[PDB]
Symmetry: C4
Subunit: 31 residues, 4 copies
Amino acid sequence: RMKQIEDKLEEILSKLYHIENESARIKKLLG
Amino acid sequence: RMKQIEDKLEEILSKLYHIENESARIKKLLGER
Amino acid sequence: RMKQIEDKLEEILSKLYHIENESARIKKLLG
Amino acid sequence: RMKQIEDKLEEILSKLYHIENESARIKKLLGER
């Protein structure tokens, strides 16, 4: 139930961390 | 209900994979130009 | 309870839509 | 519990605002160069 939502949320945040590093990379590649 | 949640979380999820992809593309763009 | 999670999820996806348009913009600005 | 959820959702949330910001910055970058 709730464990299951959380667990998704833990995944989703992890995609969100990856998405930041990527943005961080692109800024560097830019200036 | 708890199943509308589940669908939306899967949808959040695909949208995440989609955006990793669009940004990877650009990173890769710039990574030659 | 659950209404409340959903409602957050509905918001979070909406930030995720905005984040795409932005990426879409940047690609355009790039090539 | 249902409160670990709430914290993480707020954290997902700030991370969203953070990334809108980092991408807006770049859009704005490129928007002159």
